[PDB]
Design a protein around this ligand. Structure first.
Ligand SMILES: [Ca+2]
Ligand SMILES: [Ca+2]
Ligand SMILES: [Ca+2]
Lengths: 531, 532, 536
C-alpha cells in the first residue's frame, strides 16, 4: 500500500483523527463558512469521503458578523464511552493584540447524528482537547489567550478536570508546558503509550516555521521532558521540499498495531526570479492548508517519523485491504455537500431550490465585502489547473443589481465577474477585484454589451497555476475572453498576511442587490472540471 | 437674547432640527452606542434637555457585531400629519472601498413614544431624508453608495416618491444633483420657501474642509442652480477660528417668523510647536463633533448666515422669553441614568443588574474592550477639556483573566483602561493597558501596584487636563496615590486615528471583563463627573 | 502695458529682483544643475531674456556628490557702490532632520563681467541677504538652521554687520523675528521706504500654504510689528486659482516711481475624479516653480498687492515702452558652434572633455560614456527645462554599442529616483534594440527588456522623439526620418512633479535632455546631430 499526500486537497486544515473500530474519521476546521466542521471517512487511510457536517444549525453555531479568519478554529473529535465528542472554538476577534472566543462541546451516538445541543466549556483559550484516561477520568487541555499571552512573551498549556455526569469543569488549572524557543505553542494533545504520558504540541506558527514538538512524563501533571531532537516533524530546513508548512499533528493508533498521525501541509507556487529564501520567495499557496498523513515508529520510548522529519509525498499504508469531475445540476431538494455559504445557513433568505425546479435561485443581498448576509454559494479550489462554468439567467433593472462568478479568499481579497445593467446601454459585463482592499474596475468605463435576445449568459473561469482568466458566451458554442489577466497567487495566505491568514481560495456563485428592492438570478448548473 | 454655540457638547453630530407648535427638537446620531438616537428639547433654542431615546429595543435596532464607526448614522426627524417621523441608517460596512447598510422608518404620536415597528425603506444609500410637500405627496431623498459611488468619481443625490397609506416607494429614481469640485456630497434636505425649492447639501467631508452648499429650483425634479457664493457656511479658510468643521446643516423656521439652521462643529486642541497648516497642525478634537446653531437671513431669494460664512461662538436668539436655565449616578433606581450608554447591545441581565444588590451597579464578566459582540461597559461622553471622574469599586478576582475598572474609550483599537486584577504570587493588583492604533502598551504588568488584602473598597479616578490625563487610586477615600503613567488625550481624537471610521469621540465609563468565562461580578457604588 | 504671468516659464524659483539705471535683472536658483544661477534682463518688466550664468567654474562652485534638491538655493543679487553682489548657498544635506551648507559672496562690475573669487560668509543658515543702508553700513540677514531650528519649534531671522573693506562679519547676532503660527519662516529681506524699515518674510513652506508676511519698525534691530492683515500675498484660500504656491517675494522700486514685487508660483494640473481638497487634489505641477510679477500700492504705511492677495494672470506694467519681443518656442540647437546653447545644462559638473566634446566631430555633440542617471557624481547628461504642457522634443543619434552596459538616448528627468529613459543598446542575441526604463519613487519599471524593438543593421541613424500632452507623454522612434513608430508604453507626466514625489527635496521640476551611459567603463560615445523643442 502507498498513500499519496495530501490525502485531503484544498482548504482543509487542523486534522483531528479518531477511530471507531475499523472506521477512521478526520475532522477539519471550516472557519467562517457554513456548515462548520467537515468529517471524512476511510477504511484504508488512503481514500477519504465526506460523511458529516455536524454544525448545521444556528442554535449550535452562529457566525453573523464574525471577522475574517474567525469562526470555527481547530476542532477536536474523539470517541469514548459509546459516543462521539466534538469540541470547537468560535473566535470573535482576530485583528487585535489578543483574541476572544467561546468553546463548546457536542456529542452524538453516531457520526451521522443526531448531535446534542452545545454545552459551554469556558472561553479561556483555543485549541481545546479532551483526554479520556483509562481510569474513567477526563481532562480538558487548552492554550490560554489574552493580554501578554500571545507569545509576548507567554505561551502556556493548561489542564482542567472534566466531569461527564454533570457537565462542569473544575476551577483548578495546572500548567503542563511553558514553551520552546520557537514559540507559538498550540495544538495540545495527550496520549498514553507504554507507561508514559505523551504531550504533542505545535510550534513556530502555521507558516513555513511550523513544527511538531513531543514531550513525555510519568504523571499527568508533569514535569515534562522534551524530545531529544526537540522537533519531531518540520519542513522549515528544506525550502525546496514539495510539501511545506508541515505541522499540527494528530496522532492515532490503528487496530493493526501501527501508528499514524495526520498533519497540515501546503504545496507552494514559486514566482520566477525571486530568490528562494527572500521575502515571499518560498512560494505562494492558493489552495490553502491541506491535510496529509505520516507513519510513526517507536525507538527507546520516543516517536519518530519514518524517512526523516520532512513531509513526504508517499507513505506506507496500513496492513488492511484496499478499498475501491464535479458538477451540480440543482435537480434535488438539498444543496451538494461540497457547496458552502458564508456565516449563515442556506434558507429562503438567500435562495431556494423549489421556486423554479431545476435551477438555483439566488436572491439579492449584500456585496462580497460584507460580513453579515451575502448570497454566495462557493466551493474549494482543489487543483492548480481547473475550469469552472455556470449558466445564468438574470434581468437587472438598475446599477445596484449584479450576479455572476467569483474567486474568493476573504472580504478584502476577491475577484468578481458579473452581469449588470447600465442606464442607456442595457445588460453589460464587468469585473471587480479587491487586492488588499484596493479596488480595480477596468471595464466599468466601457463594458461588454449583452444582446437583448440572449436568454442565457454563460460564465467561466480558467486557472492555470499563477494566472486565471474569465470568459463569457451567449450561445454556449462560441466563447469570448474578458481582456483582464489576474494573478492567482494573490489569493494566497503568504501574500495577504496579517493576523488572519488561515483560509484558502474558493470558487462559487454570487448575486447581490445593494438597493434592497428585490432581484433573483437563476443558475442552471455548476461544473468544476480539472485538467 | 444670546446663544453660546456649542449648544450640545460632546459626541453629538448630525443635528436634525424639527418643531411642533412651540417646541423644538434635535436628533443626533449615536453610531455604535445603545440606545440609538438622542432627542433634545427646547423652547428658546438656548437651553437643551434630553427627552427621548426611541431606538431602545433589539427588534428596532440590532448592532451585535457591527463595525466601528458604524451603526446609526445621520438621522432625520420630521413632524407632519399629526405624528413624528424618524429615518435612520444601520451601516454594516465601514472599512472598505464601498459601504453597505439598511434604512428604516419609525413613527410615534408623541416624542416619548410609543414608537411603531420599523418599515424597510431600501438599502441604496445613507443620509436619508423625507420631504413633506404642501400638496400631500412625500418624497424620499438619499445619496447612493456602492462601487464607484464614493466620490470615485460619482456622488449623486436621488429622489423617490413615497406612499404613506401603503408604505411603499416608487421604483423610479430621479437625480437632482451631481456634485461640485468639493465632492463628498451628502446630507440632502429639501425646503419650500416663497415659490422655490431649496436643496441643502454638505460637501467636502466631515473634516476641516466641511461646507454647506445651497441650490434652488422652480420644480422638484430640477434643474437646480448653485448659490452665488457656492458655499453658505464654511470654516476651512479660517484655520484659527475657535469652531471648525462647520457643516451638515439642518434648516428650520420658527413660529416667530425667523429662520435658524443647526450644524455640526468641533473645538480643536493644538499641540505646541506644530505648524498651523502642517499635517495635524489644525488641531485635535477629543470631544468629537458637537452641534451648534446659526441665524439665517434672506437676501434676493437666497439664504445667508448672519455675521459671515464661519461659525461663531455667540449668535442672536429668537424673540421668545428665556426659560429658566455636577453629574453623578448613585445607582439607586430601577434604570440607569439616561446619560449612560452601552455598546451595541441593550442593558439586560447578561450585562448587569441594578436589583441583585440594591444601591450598587453589578457588572458581570464578558469580553474585553477590543470586542464587537458583548462587553459589560457603561460609559458616558466627555463634555469638557478639564474634568474628573470617580467611582467606588468592590471586586474579588480569582485568576488573571478577571478584571474590572475605569476606562477612556474612543473605538475598539484606541482606548485606555485602569483596572484591578489578580496575580498568582501577589494577590489583588492594579494595572493599566493602553491601545494606540492597535499597538498595546502595558507598563505596569512586570511590577504591579499591590492592594491590601483587607481593603473592602478600591477607589478609582481619572483626571483630564486638556492634552493629558492621569489615573489615581485609593483604599480609604481620603489619601490618593497616582499611577506613574501619563497619557495623551489628543490620541482619543478623530484627527489622529483616521481611516474610514473617524466619526465618534471619547467616552469615560466603567468596565468589567472575564475572558475565562467562569463568571465574576464587580459592584460599583456610584459614578461622578465633576467639571473644573 | 499688460504683463502675463508667469514671466519666466519652467523651473525658475526664488526670484531676486534688482536694477541698475533703467535695466532690471532677476536671479533664479538652479539647485543641482550647472552652471548655477540664471540672470534674466528686461527693460519693461514684461519680456525677459537670459544675460548671464555667473557660477560657471569649479573654483566657485563644486557640487560633486551633492544630494538631490541640494546645491544652489535661493540667491541674493544686489547692486550698490558701482558693482553687483551675489550671495549663494551650497546646501550639502537635504534628507536629514537638519541641514548643512555654505554661503559665499561674489562681485562683478558688469552682469556679464568677471566675477571675483568667493568670500566665505558663514555656514550658519540659508537664505542669505545683504542690506545696503543709506549711511554706508551693510547688514547680513539669514535664517539659522540646525537641531531644533527647522520649525521644531524655532524659526528665527538673525542679522550680522558686514564690513565690505575687509570682508569680515561681526560675531554678534541680533534676532529680528521669531515666527507666526504658519511657520517655516524664511526669505528675509530688508527695505527702507519713508521712515520705516520693512522686513519681508516667506511663511508656510513652498507648497500651497505659501504666503508673504511684511513687518515694519523704526530702528533696524527692532522691535517689528506685523501687517494689519498678516499676509500681503497668498493663494492658499483660493484652491481654484490658476496660479498657486504664491510666495517668496522680492520687492523693487522702478525709476518711474512705481513698486513691483517678484514671486514664485506654479500652474497645477488636476487629475479627473479626485476631490479638490483631498490628498493631492489641488493639482500636480510638472513644470516646477515659476516666477511671476505683481504690483504694489501704498496705503497708510503698509504695502498691498493690487487686485487682492492672490496671484493674478494679468498685471499692469510700468510706464515704459515695450521694447519689441520675438517669436518664442521653436528652440533648437544644431551643435555647430563651440559652446552649448545657454538653455542646456549639465548635472553637478562643468561641461568639459570628460563628458563630451563639440570639436571631435564638427556639427555633432559627442557624449562620452559615464555613470547612469541614478548617479550623483558624473553623468553625461545635457538637458533643458520643460516650459509647456504640450510640446515635442526630437533628436537624431548615431550609436554602435557592443555590450549591454552601453546605452544612449532621450530622457525626462526630475531627480535621481524619478526619471524616464528611452535608449538604444545592444543585446547579445539580436543586436541593436530600443528599450525604456522608468524610475518612480525608486522602483524600476522595464517593460520592453524581455521583447525589445529590433533596429536594422543598415540603419545609419536612429531618430527619437518624446510627445508630452498634459497628463501623459509617450516615446517614438524612426529609422528614415519620415515614417514614425510609437513605443507601446504610456507614461504619466504628473509623476515628475513635486507634489507627487514629496520629501524634504521637492524643490525643482522636470527636464528633457540627452543622456549617454557606459557602466562598463570600456569607453563609448554617442553622436547627436540636433535637439529640437517645438511647442504646440
Ligand atoms: Ca439543472
Ligand atoms: Ca449607590
Ligand atoms: Ca549639426
Amino acid at each position: 500500500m502507498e498513500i499519496t499526500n495530501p490525502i485531503l486537497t484544498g482548504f482543509n486544515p487542523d486534522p483531528s483523527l479518531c477511530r471507531q473500530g475499523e472506521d477512521y474519521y478526520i475532522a477539519t476546521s471550516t472557519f467562517e463558512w457554513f456548515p462548520g466542521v467537515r468529517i471524512y471517512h476511510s477504511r484504508d487511510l488512503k481514500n477519504w469521503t465526506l460523511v458529516s457536517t455536524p454544525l448545521d444549525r444556528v442554535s449550535m453555531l452562529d457566525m453573523k458578523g464574525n471577522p475574517d479568519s474567525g469562526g470555527i478554529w481547530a476542532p477536536c473529535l474523539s470517541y469514548a464511552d459509546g459516543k462521539f465528542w466534538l469540541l470547537y472554538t468560535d473566535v470573535k476577534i482576530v485583528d487585535s493584540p489578543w483574541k476572544n472566543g467561546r468553546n463548546f462541546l457536542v456529542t452524538a451516538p453516531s457520526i451521522e447524528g443526531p448531535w446534542s445541543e452545545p454545552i459551554p466549556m469556558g472561553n479561556g483559550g483555543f485549541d481545546p482537547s479532551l483526554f479520556h484516561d483509562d481510569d474513567g477520568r477526563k481532562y480538558y487541555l487548552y492554550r490560554p489567550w489574552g493580554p501578554r499571552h500571545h507569545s509576548n512573551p507567554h505561551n502556556t498549556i493548561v489542564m482542567q478536570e472534566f466531569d461527564p455526569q454533570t457537565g462542569t469543569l473544575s476551577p483548578e488549572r495546572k500548567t503542563l508546558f511553558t514553551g520552546t524557543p520557537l514559540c507559538y505553542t498550540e495544538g495540545a494533545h495527550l496520549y498514553r503509550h507504554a507507561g508514559w504520558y505523551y504531550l504533542m504540541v505545535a510550534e513556530g506558527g502555521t507558516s513555513y516555521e511550523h513544527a511538531v514538538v513531543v514531550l513525555r512524563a510519568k504523571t499527568i501533571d508533569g514535569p515534562y521532558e522534551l524530545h531529544p531532537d526537540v522537533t519531531m516533524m518540520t519542513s522549515w530546513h528544506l525550502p525546496e521540499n514539495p510539501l511545506q508548512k508541515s505541522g499540527h499533528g494528530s496522532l492515532l493508533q490503528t487496530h493493526t498495531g501501527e501508528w499514524y498521525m495526520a498533519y497540515l501541509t501546503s504545496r507552494p507556487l514559486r514566482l520566477p526570479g525571486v530568490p528562494l529564501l527572500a521575502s515571499g520567495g518560498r512560494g505562494y499557496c492558493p489552495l490553502g492548508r491541506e491535510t496529509g498523513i505520516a507513519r510513526i515508529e517507536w525507538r527507546d520510548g520516543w516517536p519518530y517519523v519514518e524517512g526523516g522529519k520532512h513531509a513526504q509525498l508517499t507513505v506506507k499504508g496500513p496492513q488492511v485491504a484496499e478499498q475501491p469531475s464535479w458538477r451540480d445540476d440543482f435537480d434535488g431538494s438539498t444543496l451538494d455537500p461540497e457547496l458552502q455559504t458564508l456565516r449563515i445557513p442556506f434558507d429562503d433568505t438567500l435562495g431556494s431550490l423549489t421556486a423554479r425546479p431545476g435551477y438555483l435561485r439566488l436572491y439579492g443581498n449584500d456585496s462580497l465585502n460584507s460580513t453579515f448576509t451575502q448570497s454566495t454559494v462557493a466551493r474549494r479550489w482543489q487543483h492548480f489547473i481547473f475550469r469552472a462554468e455556470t449558466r445564468m439567467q438574470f434581468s437587472p433593472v438598475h446599477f445596484q443589481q449584479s450576479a455572476g462568478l467569483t474567486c474568493y479568499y476573504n472580504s478584502k481579497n476577491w475577484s468578481y465577474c458579473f452581469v449588470d445593467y447600465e442606464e442607456g446601454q442595457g445588460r453589460t459585463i464587468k469585473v471587480i477585484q479587491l487586492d488588499h482592499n484596493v479596488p480595480s474596475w477596468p471595464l466599468h468605463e466601457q463594458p461588454i454589451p449583452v444582446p437583448e435576445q440572449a436568454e442565457s449568459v454563460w460564465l467561466r473561469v480558467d486557472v492555470d497555476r499563477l494566472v486565471y482568466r474569465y470568459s463569457y458566451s451567449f450561445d454556449g458554442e462560441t466563447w469570448h475572453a474578458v481582456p483582464v489577466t489576474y494573478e492567482a497567487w494573490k489569493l494566497s495566505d503568504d501574500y495577504i498576511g496579517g493576523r488572519g491568514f488561515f483560509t484558502g481560495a474558493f470558487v462559487g456563485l454570487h448575486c447581490e442587490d445593494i438597493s434592497g428592492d428585490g432581484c433573483h438570478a437563476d443558475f442552471d448548473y455548476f461544473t468544476y472540471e480539472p485538467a
